[PDB]
Amino acid sequence: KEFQSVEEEMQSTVREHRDGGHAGGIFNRYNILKIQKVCNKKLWERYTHRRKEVSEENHNHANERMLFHGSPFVNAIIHKGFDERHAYIGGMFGAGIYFAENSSKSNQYVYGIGGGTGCPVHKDRSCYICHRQLLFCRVTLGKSFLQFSAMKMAHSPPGHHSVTGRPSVNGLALAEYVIYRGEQAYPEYLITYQIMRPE
Numbered sequence: 189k190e191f192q193s194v195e196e197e198m199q200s201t202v203r204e205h206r207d208g209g210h211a212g213g214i215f216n217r218y219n220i221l222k223i224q225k226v227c228n229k230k231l232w233e234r235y236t237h238r239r240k241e242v243s244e245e246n247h248n249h250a251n252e253r254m255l256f257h258g259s260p261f262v263n264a265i266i267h268k269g270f271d272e273r274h275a276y277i278g279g280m281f282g283a284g285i286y287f288a289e290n291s292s293k294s295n296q297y298v299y300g301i302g303g304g305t306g307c308p309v310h311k312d313r314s315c316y317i318c319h320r321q322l323l324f325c326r327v328t329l330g331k332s333f334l335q336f337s338a339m340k341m342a343h344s345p346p347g348h349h350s351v352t353g354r355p356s357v358n359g360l361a362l363a364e365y366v367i368y369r370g371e372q373a374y375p376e377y378l379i380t381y382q383i384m385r386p387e
């Protein structure tokens with residue numbers, strides 16, 4: 189049930205990408221191989237401690253969401269947690285940690301920025317063979333700053349706890365959520381999957 193709901197979120201949030209599959213590959217669905225719940229007590233406590241602080245600063249509301257994250261460094265994240273020190277000013281919203289509500293958007297980052305050179309074995313961004321991993325995360329957004337265009341931030345805007353990138357004509361196709369403190373996300377589920385060749 190718990191894993192069926194994670195599988196459903198993974199499958200149902202897939203969208204057709206503007207890049208025609210360049211970064212993440214060509215697919216309409218995934219072959220979900222495994223869903224593992226990450227139980228890291230020290231990371232969970234770091235997350236809940238920050239979540240309580242953010243709630244107190246946001247009218248007793250953490251504004252928590254379950255969001256996807258794609259990265260070549262999922263193993264390091266599950267053990268050491270998210271780390272803003274690995275985030276640099278180059279992204280659309282600057283030096284933050286980025287999440288998506290659409291699994292296929294996070295899938296574009298699994299092998300690096302713009303999909304990098306794809307899977308290590310075949311150097312294929314559309315590899316249907318190699319097993320990929322995504323995280324489905326608990327993310328504390330708190331008072332989230334709504335933004336449409338590029339705004340290179342080092343930290344959350346004054347009085348805020350995150351940035352939400354909203355879709356716009358000359359901007360984003362899909363939403364994205366950005367935190368600037370690693371302790372504001374917990375890597376709750378590790379999903380192992382393949383993208384599937386369209387029928």
Ligand SMILES: O=c1nc[nH]c2ccccc12
Pocket residue numbers: 256257258259286287288293294295297363364365
């Ligand atoms: O999951 C992500 N991993 C890195 N960059 C992103 C940018 C936007 C939305 C999601 C992501």
Ligand SMILES: [Zn+2]
Pocket residue numbers: 307308309310311312315316317318
């Ligand atoms: Zn491959």
